[PDB]
């Protein structure tokens, strides 16, 4: 097993870099990204799930806190304050805390696993927090960007 979870740095397609902010994830222009560093993304593989739809598991804080979509009947993205080594060690699925990795080569979304058809997303508006869209059936240059550079720390 992990000693430690994995180091992953984040930026949507547009490059704005995900960086924490009062609790919550924002994708920062280049204005913020003088002036905040990026958040370390911790990652883990979501071991209960099926591995072919590439289970993972993301928090922040030095994995302090996870993301989750949440219990209710609709999706609502929010930081838990929970150990992601405590979800990635316990025997338990955690699905709302997870999301399907689609690995589309330079870049990767991810789909909540509880919540079928919603997608982490960034607005194309910079300083927003990352939140949860489903997909239009056509593109626009003002819609939600759902498409994420997933690289690991050096």
């Known amino acids: 097993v992990l000693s430690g979870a994995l180091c992953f740095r984040m930026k949507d397609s547009a490059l704005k870099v995900l960086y924490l902010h009062n609790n919550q994830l924002l994708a920062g222009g280049l204005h913020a990204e003088k002036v905040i560093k990026g958040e370390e993304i911790s990652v883990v593989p979501n071991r209960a799930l099926d ?66 058809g919603w997608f982490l997303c960034t607005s194309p508006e910079a300083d927003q927090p990352v939140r949860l869209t489903q997909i239009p059936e056509d593109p626009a240059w003002d819609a939600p960007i759902t498409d994420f550079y997933f690289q690991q720390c050096d």
């Open 51 to 116: 591995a072919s739809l590439s289970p993972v598991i993301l928090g922040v804080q030095g994995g302090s806190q996870c993301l989750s979509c949440g219990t209710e009947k609709g999706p609502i993205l929010k930081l838990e304050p929970v150990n992601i080594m405590e979800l990635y060690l316990g025997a338990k699925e955690s699905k709302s805390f997870t999301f399907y990795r689609r690995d589309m080569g330079l870049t990767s979304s991810f789909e909540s696993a509880a919540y079928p």
